[PDB]
Amino acid sequence: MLIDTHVHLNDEQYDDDLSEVITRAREAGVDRMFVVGFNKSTIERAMKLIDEYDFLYGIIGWHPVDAIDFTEEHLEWIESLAQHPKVIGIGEMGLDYHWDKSPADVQKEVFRKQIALAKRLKLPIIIHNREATQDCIDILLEEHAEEVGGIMHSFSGSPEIADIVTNKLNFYISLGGPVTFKNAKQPKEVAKHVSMERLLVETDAPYLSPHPYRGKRNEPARVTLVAEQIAELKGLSYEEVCEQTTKNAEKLFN
């Protein structure tokens, strides 16, 4: 039994066939999934899915790419939604230097505001980092994010950054489809290097479908290919990776 700790079932890409996508994941041993909302539309859709399906939990927050759209009203709105017993984490939050819609200074202020929110709610945080690794680490360290705990979601950095993440911040590291890519050296090295007690699995569906479905619409059932690859890389049974990644998710979340 696995948990897909990070999935966008709230995406328009599932509008035709969500029920079948969820059934395929359940039938593959994916018993629980954490639906991630990161702006007004995706939060609304997320809150409707966690009401409709018993085994779906919500992570809500504000995406760095959309940081310029984050208002005082949105921050009070997320704080009141988080009182829902199945809203278990705050995110995906962080920094993204690939897209230019939001400048870095606005991204950093929205990031700090959501750390402060997560501390008030006593919920863990889910971190999106794209091309902003050292700026994210400095923020997590400055804002004492070790108080709330969290995930560096779909982490690709050096093992030296992984060690700051697990040993200084006491965060978890989630791995997704990229651990399955042939020439993806960094994620395979992260999976080998990081303790099994710090690892979580995710799809980020519909994005980043693993081998052998790269370029195709991802779905939560494919989290089994991530878990298989972690088993292969660490010399562990699939059963051991399912059991430990579940233990880890249950420990971090409520």
For the annotated binding site for a divalent metal cation, the residues are: 6, 8, 92, 128, 153, 204
Residue of closest CB approach to Ni ion: 128
**Contact flag: residue 98 with a copy of itself (CB under 8 A):** yes
Strands in 56-60's sheet, in edge-to-edge order, are 2-7, 30-37, 56-60, 87-96, 125-130, 150-152, 172-175, 199-201
Task: Give residue 190's identity as a one-letter amino acid code.
Answer: V
Query: Mask of contacts with a copy of itself, 27-66, x by CB under 8 A?
Result: ----------------------------------------
What is the spatial distance between Cα 17 and Cα 19, in angstroms, rounded to a whole number? 6
**Contact flag: residue 183 with a copy of itself (CB under 8 A):** yes
Known binding-site residues equal 6, 8, 92, 128, 153, 204
Output the smallest distance, CB 100 to a copy of itself, in A. 4
Q: Pick the binder of a copy of itself from 211, 231, 238, 240 (CB under 8 A).
A: 211
Q: Pick the binder of a copy of itself from 73, 100, 235, 237 (CB under 8 A).
A: 100
* DSSP line for 10-51: TSGGGTTTHHHHHHHHHHTTEEEEEEEE-SHHHHHHHHHHHH
Query: Mask of contacts with a copy of itself, 67-96, x by CB under 8 A?
Result: -----------------------------x
- DSSP β-bridge partners for residue 59: 36, 89
**Contact flag: residue 106 with a copy of itself (CB under 8 A):** no
What is the spatial distance between Cα 196 and Cα 217, in angstroms, rounded to a whole number? 28
Whether 132 contacts 105, CB under 8 Å: no
Task: Give residue 16's identity as a one-letter amino acid code.
Answer: D
Q: Kindly report the CA angle at 200 between 194 and 201, in degrees rounded to 5?
A: 120
Interface stretch with a copy of itself, choices 99-107, 108-116, 165-173, 218-226 (CB under 8 A): 99-107
* Interacting residues with a copy of itself (CB under 8 A): 96-100, 103-104, 131, 181-185, 211, 214
